[PDB]
């Protein structure tokens, strides 16, 4: 087509979606990771994760307001990945990289799994 | 912080949100613009438009599944702006610029109003 494109649009949309999350505006699901609860927007979770895409396209699961993750999932790892979904920034540290990578494999977030593998290889 | 950032994340999120819209997945509102109907995600509309942000933060309107726009709004202008919200690309043409600018003023989409004003000034 002959469209023009606003470079910062996608980043500005994501910043506003994170502001809605902060303010608990139109959040429509609670993700439970053992004793912790995280509120989010189903559409953002599906846009970032192959696991959430599969969950919320299922005719029965699409209607659930609570999703319980596998008990082996680390809540801090999940929190770091949820923040990445809404900001593009990943708080990857020596003390959390194994939990973050394991969580990203489970959630099916291939670009995160890729940077974790590279950071681990560099330390070996 | 000491975060790393994935450059293409926000663009990839927006592309996936547009794929959900295409496929009518988790759309939760119908916007009526006279005889036409447009399905969308409330969160994407709020993230892009000051008018939708005000509508869906209202304690009564947040619960509506149908929103009727002012009868003066042009459906093609709205369609072009809805496509911009989900893609960052604006199909601005000599034959539609006046309707697009009027719609962007109503929806409170300041960056679009800005490029329309500039394109109009260039033709004068």
């Amino acid at each position: 087509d002959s469209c023009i494109q606003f470079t910062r649009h996608a980043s500005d949309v994501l910043l506003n979606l994170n502001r809605l999350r902060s303010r608990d505006i139109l959040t429509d699901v609670v993700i439970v990771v053992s004793r912790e609860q995280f509120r989010a927007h189903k559409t953002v979770l599906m846009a970032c994760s192959g696991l959430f895409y599969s969950i919320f396209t299922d005719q029965l699961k699409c209607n659930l307001s609570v999703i319980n993750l596998d008990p082996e999932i680390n809540p801090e790892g999940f929190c770091i990945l949820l923040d990445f979904m809404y900001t593009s920034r990943l708080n990857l540290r020596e003390g959390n990289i194994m939990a973050v990578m394991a969580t990203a494999m489970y959630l099916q977030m291939e670009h995160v799994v890729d940077t974790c593998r590279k950071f681990i290889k560099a330390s070996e | 912080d000491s975060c790393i950032q994935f450059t293409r994340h926000a663009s990839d999120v927006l592309l996936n949100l547009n794929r959900l819209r295409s496929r009518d997945i988790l759309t939760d509102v119908v916007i009526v613009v006279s005889r036409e109907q447009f399905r969308a995600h409330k969160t994407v509309l709020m993230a892009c438009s000051g008018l939708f942000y005000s509508i869906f933060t209202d304690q009564l309107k947040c619960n509506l599944s149908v929103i009727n726009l002012d009868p003066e709004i042009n459906p093609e202008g709205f369609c072009i702006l809805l496509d911009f919200m989900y893609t960052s690309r604006l199909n601005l043409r000599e034959g539609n610029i006046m309707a697009v600018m009027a719609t962007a003023m109503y929806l409170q989409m300041e960056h679009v109003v800005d490029t329309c004003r500039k394109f109009i000034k260039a033709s004068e």
Binding site: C3, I4, Q5, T7 | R89, L90, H111, T115
Partner: peptide
């Protein structure tokens, strides 16, 4: 704004 740019030409994509």
């Amino acid at each position: 704004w740019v030409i994509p």
